């Protein structure tokens, strides 16, 4: 009274509408994704504030975990959506802004657009349950840390296994409670790698003024800050395998 898993279910932020004026230049479309992505990330912040145990990490580890994991989150969420909504077929960023095969033909998109689908693809391969989903999503936040760990190391440490626990529970719903974990922690692994791409691009488009690509205040602030930190490659992807 109540389960944390059910608490998870409730805090998960509502799907966002893109407000896209759908009458199609590829600068614009990506500019829009960015505009959307900004609010999406703002929403993930409240969601962080209301994670159980998040407030008693240290402000710096709060910043830090978000800042490093933020793409990992949005890309993951986008996978889930694109799973639920077209069972893998299309990228469904917002109900109003869906990328069918057709919009991938658009100039520079495809590349990224294929590696976003890969993420959805993995939901389709593993047939992930919504509870299973939420669980990892939380983990993903706690999976991208500095090479020289944390400003409140101990605290994190417990939390991490806490939510891994919760992922147990999730598949507990036989001979799976260590067995399916492999298939699913393998995913949590392969994220770091697939995010890697999207994360880069994003970077490229950010510093490369003469592309006319627009990013909103929120994200600017974080990319422009996370830039050098990721230059060094001074970021530890915590895996399982």
């Amino acid at each position: 009274f109540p389960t944390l898993i059910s608490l998870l279910e409730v805090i998960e932020p509502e799907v966002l509408y893109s407000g896209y004026d759908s009458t199609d230049t590829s600068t614009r479309l990506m500019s829009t994704l960015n505009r959307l992505g900004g609010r999406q990330v703002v929403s993930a912040v409240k969601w962080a504030k209301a994670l159980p145990g998040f407030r008693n990490l240290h402000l710096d580890d709060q910043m830090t975990l978000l800042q490093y994991s933020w793409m990992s989150l949005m890309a993951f969420s986008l996978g889930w959506r694109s799973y639920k909504q077209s069972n893998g077929n299309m990228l469904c960023f917002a109900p109003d802004l869906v990328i069918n095969e057709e919009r991938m033909q658009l100039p520079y998109m495809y590349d990224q657009c294929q590696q976003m689908l890969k993420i959805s693809s993995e939901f389709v391969r593993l047939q992930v349950s919504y509870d299973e989903y939420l669980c990892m999503k939380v983990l993903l936040l706690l999976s991208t840390v500095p090479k020289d760990g944390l400003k409140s190391q101990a605290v994190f440490d417990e939390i991490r296994m806490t939510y891994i626990k919760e992922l147990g529970k999730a598949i507990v719903k036989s001979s799976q409670n260590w067995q399916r974990f492999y298939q699913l922690t393998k995913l949590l692994d392969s994220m770091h790698e697939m995010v890697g791409g999207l994360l880069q691009f994003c970077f490229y488009t950010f510093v490369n003024k003469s592309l006319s690509v627009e990013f909103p205040e929120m994200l600017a602030e974080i990319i422009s800050n996370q830039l050098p930190k990721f230059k060094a490659g001074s970021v530890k992807p915590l895996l399982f395998h």
Partner: peptide, 13 residues
């Protein structure tokens, strides 16, 4: 300068 908005949301006051 760590990021202005992201910070304020976590700290307030």
């Amino acid at each position: 300068s760590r990021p202005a908005i992201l910070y304020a949301l976590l700290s307030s006051s």
